[PDB]
Design an enzyme around this catalytic site. Structure first.
Site, PDB file in Angstrom:
ATOM      1  N   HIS A 120       0.819  -1.206   0.000  1.00 14.92           N
ATOM      2  CA  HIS A 120       0.000   0.000   0.000  1.00 14.92           C
ATOM      3  C   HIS A 120       0.856   1.262   0.000  1.00 14.92           C
ATOM      4  O   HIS A 120       0.387   2.336  -0.365  1.00 14.92           O
ATOM      5  CB  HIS A 120      -0.989   0.013   1.173  1.00 14.92           C
ATOM      6  CG  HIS A 120      -0.347  -0.073   2.520  1.00 14.92           C
ATOM      7  ND1 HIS A 120      -0.215  -1.264   3.201  1.00 14.92           N
ATOM      8  CD2 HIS A 120       0.181   0.880   3.322  1.00 14.92           C
ATOM      9  CE1 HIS A 120       0.366  -1.040   4.366  1.00 14.92           C
ATOM     10  NE2 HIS A 120       0.617   0.253   4.465  1.00 14.92           N
ATOM     11  N   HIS A 132       7.271   6.745   5.973  1.00 11.87           N
ATOM     12  CA  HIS A 132       6.655   6.360   4.720  1.00 11.87           C
ATOM     13  C   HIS A 132       5.928   7.587   4.215  1.00 11.87           C
ATOM     14  O   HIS A 132       5.914   8.624   4.884  1.00 11.87           O
ATOM     15  CB  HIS A 132       5.646   5.236   4.940  1.00 11.87           C
ATOM     16  CG  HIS A 132       4.557   5.600   5.900  1.00 11.87           C
ATOM     17  ND1 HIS A 132       4.688   5.454   7.264  1.00 11.87           N
ATOM     18  CD2 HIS A 132       3.354   6.189   5.699  1.00 11.87           C
ATOM     19  CE1 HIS A 132       3.615   5.941   7.862  1.00 11.87           C
ATOM     20  NE2 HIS A 132       2.790   6.393   6.934  1.00 11.87           N
ATOM     21  N   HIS A 171       2.383   9.116   1.677  1.00  9.74           N
ATOM     22  CA  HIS A 171       1.045   8.932   1.127  1.00  9.74           C
ATOM     23  C   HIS A 171       1.081   9.923  -0.036  1.00  9.74           C
ATOM     24  O   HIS A 171       1.530  11.056   0.136  1.00  9.74           O
ATOM     25  CB  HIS A 171      -0.029   9.346   2.139  1.00  9.74           C
ATOM     26  CG  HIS A 171      -0.043   8.505   3.377  1.00  9.74           C
ATOM     27  ND1 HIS A 171      -0.812   7.366   3.496  1.00  9.74           N
ATOM     28  CD2 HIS A 171       0.637   8.624   4.542  1.00  9.74           C
ATOM     29  CE1 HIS A 171      -0.607   6.823   4.685  1.00  9.74           C
ATOM     30  NE2 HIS A 171       0.268   7.567   5.337  1.00  9.74           N
ATOM     31  N   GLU A 192      -2.842  13.430   3.482  1.00  9.49           N
ATOM     32  CA  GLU A 192      -3.927  12.930   4.309  1.00  9.49           C
ATOM     33  C   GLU A 192      -4.479  14.108   5.087  1.00  9.49           C
ATOM     34  O   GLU A 192      -5.676  14.372   5.052  1.00  9.49           O
ATOM     35  CB  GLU A 192      -3.410  11.828   5.229  1.00  9.49           C
ATOM     36  CG  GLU A 192      -2.923  10.628   4.426  1.00  9.49           C
ATOM     37  CD  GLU A 192      -2.929   9.354   5.228  1.00  9.49           C
ATOM     38  OE1 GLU A 192      -2.238   9.298   6.265  1.00  9.49           O
ATOM     39  OE2 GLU A 192      -3.635   8.409   4.820  1.00  9.49           O
ATOM     40  N   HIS A 250       5.347  10.725   6.702  1.00  3.32           N
ATOM     41  CA  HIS A 250       5.046  10.384   8.077  1.00  3.32           C
ATOM     42  C   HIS A 250       6.238   9.692   8.717  1.00  3.32           C
ATOM     43  O   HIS A 250       6.645   8.610   8.283  1.00  3.32           O
ATOM     44  CB  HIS A 250       3.817   9.471   8.132  1.00  3.32           C
ATOM     45  CG  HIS A 250       2.533  10.180   7.823  1.00  3.32           C
ATOM     46  ND1 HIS A 250       1.377   9.513   7.478  1.00  3.32           N
ATOM     47  CD2 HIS A 250       2.217  11.497   7.839  1.00  3.32           C
ATOM     48  CE1 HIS A 250       0.405  10.389   7.292  1.00  3.32           C
ATOM     49  NE2 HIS A 250       0.887  11.599   7.505  1.00  3.32           N
ATOM     50  N   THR A 289      -3.534   6.275  10.393  1.00  2.00           N
ATOM     51  CA  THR A 289      -4.433   6.584   9.287  1.00  2.00           C
ATOM     52  C   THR A 289      -4.714   5.364   8.417  1.00  2.00           C
ATOM     53  O   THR A 289      -5.452   5.456   7.436  1.00  2.00           O
ATOM     54  CB  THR A 289      -3.872   7.692   8.404  1.00  2.00           C
ATOM     55  OG1 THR A 289      -2.665   7.233   7.784  1.00  2.00           O
ATOM     56  CG2 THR A 289      -3.595   8.936   9.238  1.00  2.00           C
ATOM     57  N   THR A 290      -4.101   4.234   8.759  1.00  3.03           N
ATOM     58  CA  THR A 290      -4.342   2.981   8.034  1.00  3.03           C
ATOM     59  C   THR A 290      -4.787   1.942   9.049  1.00  3.03           C
ATOM     60  O   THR A 290      -4.538   2.085  10.246  1.00  3.03           O
ATOM     61  CB  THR A 290      -3.069   2.398   7.371  1.00  3.03           C
ATOM     62  OG1 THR A 290      -2.200   1.873   8.386  1.00  3.03           O
ATOM     63  CG2 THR A 290      -2.334   3.458   6.571  1.00  3.03           C
TER      64      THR A 290
HETATM   65  N1  LIG Z   1       1.186   5.560  12.734  1.00  2.48           N
HETATM   66  C1  LIG Z   1       1.311   4.668  11.691  1.00  2.48           C
HETATM   67  C2  LIG Z   1       1.760   3.374  11.974  1.00  2.48           C
HETATM   68  C3  LIG Z   1       1.918   2.394  10.949  1.00  2.48           C
HETATM   69  C4  LIG Z   1       2.398   1.031  11.322  1.00  2.48           C
HETATM   70  F1  LIG Z   1       1.801   0.035  10.640  1.00  2.48           F
HETATM   71  F2  LIG Z   1       3.719   0.855  11.152  1.00  2.48           F
HETATM   72  F3  LIG Z   1       2.169   0.740  12.614  1.00  2.48           F
HETATM   73  C5  LIG Z   1       1.604   2.773   9.588  1.00  2.48           C
HETATM   74  S1  LIG Z   1       1.750   1.708   8.154  1.00  2.48           S
HETATM   75  N2  LIG Z   1       0.590   0.647   8.160  1.00  2.48           N
HETATM   76  O1  LIG Z   1       1.593   2.546   7.002  1.00  2.48           O
HETATM   77  O2  LIG Z   1       2.986   1.003   8.292  1.00  2.48           O
HETATM   78  C6  LIG Z   1       1.149   4.074   9.320  1.00  2.48           C
HETATM   79  C7  LIG Z   1       1.002   5.005  10.352  1.00  2.48           C
HETATM   80  S2  LIG Z   1       0.431   6.622   9.965  1.00  2.48           S
HETATM   81  N3  LIG Z   1      -0.106   6.623   8.482  1.00  2.48           N
HETATM   82  O3  LIG Z   1      -0.685   6.905  10.816  1.00  2.48           O
HETATM   83  O4  LIG Z   1       1.588   7.450  10.031  1.00  2.48           O
HETATM   84 ZN   LIG Z   2       1.110   7.470   7.182  1.00  2.00          ZN
END
Ligand SMILES: Nc1cc(C(F)(F)F)c(S(N)(=O)=O)cc1S(N)(=O)=O
Ligand SMILES: [Zn+2]
EC number: 4.2.1.1
Length: 257
Positions: free
Chosen positions: A61, A91, A93, A103, A116, A195-196
């Site tokens: 994703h 990562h 978005h 986002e 992020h 957010t995922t």
């Molecule tokens: N806070 C967090 C933790 C993870 C985590 F999965 F690593 F936990 C992911 S992920 N699925 O994209 O890796 C994404 C976020 S985000 N988009 O809220 O910054």
């Molecule tokens: Zn993120």
């Protein structure tokens, strides 16, 4: 499996993850006129000088640049945070077009992408335990707009060809995340969630006001990645962003005036 398509996208997530309709979901729209300057906020401290990257992975994703968080090296402190938060990964978005991709939004404005940098509260021992706590994570969000190229991002851009499809990973050592930070650390902060999926409400969001500029060529390479695994029909990895969610009983605080 959850995704960003018409049949497994954001509007479907609530079925497997009821918290999707929770009280502190992310992202949210940041209304700059309603955000209040908060003097109780301490200075934000981003210490990435000792950061140790390990590898980059296409997870189906988006892609994660992972760091060694077995010691206090790259850490985030201060601001609205109590204690020390260790950088575990970062990562992005992004969208299919420059007019969308972020986002969080600012006065409804969508940026081309959003970075992020995910950190976990060390008082909880490990990441798995931290995500089960209201103040377990701190994510530093940085907007990306299309304009001049970001030198510090090129190393990430040029390795994407080696992790085109889901499941693919590549060694990514000695990458310095300091090269992805804008000049100003002015920020907005509020209590939110991942957010995922699993959309856990364990995040203290710290979104920088100043975006970094990346070139059209750089973002174009992000759009060449695939959601699908090797040998499968190509589904370009684009628009992997969740739309703004209800702010509800929350106030966004600003570190600046
Ligand atoms: N806070 C967090 C933790 C993870 C985590 F999965 F690593 F936990 C992911 S992920 N699925 O994209 O890796 C994404 C976020 S985000 N988009 O809220 O910054
Ligand atoms: Zn993120």
């Amino acid at each position: 499996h959850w995704g960003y398509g018409k049949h497994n996208g954001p509007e479907h997530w609530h079925k497997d993850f009821p918290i999707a309709k929770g009280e502190r979901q992310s992202p949210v729209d940041i209304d700059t006129h309603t955000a209040k300057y908060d003097p109780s906020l301490k200075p934000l401290s981003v210490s990435y000088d000792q950061a140790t990257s390990l590898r980059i992975l296409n997870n189906g994703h988006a892609f994660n640049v992972e760091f060694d968080d077995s010691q206090d090296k790259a850490v985030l402190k201060g601001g609205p945070l109590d204690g020390t938060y260790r950088l575990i990964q970062f990562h992005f978005h992004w969208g299919s077009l420059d007019g969308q991709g972020s986002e969080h939004t600012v006065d409804k404005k969508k940026y081309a992408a959003e970075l992020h940098l995910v950190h976990w509260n060390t008082k909880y021992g490990d990441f798995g335990k931290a995500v089960q706590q209201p103040d377990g994570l701190a994510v530093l969000g940085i907007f990306l707009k299309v304009g001049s190229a970001k030198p510090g991002l090129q190393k990430v851009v040029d390795v994407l060809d080696s992790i085109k499809t889901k499941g693919k990973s590549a060694d990514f050592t000695n990458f310095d995340p300091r090269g992805l930070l804008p000049e100003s650390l002015d920020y907005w902060t509020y209590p939110g969630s991942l957010t995922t999926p699993p959309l856990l409400e364990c995040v203290t969001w710290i979104v920088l006001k100043e975006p970094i500029s990346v070139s059209s060529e750089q973002v174009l390479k992000f759009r060449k990645l695939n959601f699908n695994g090797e040998g499968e029909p190509e589904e370009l990895m684009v628009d992997n962003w969740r739309p703004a969610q209800p702010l509800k009983n929350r106030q966004i605080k600003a570190s600046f005036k």
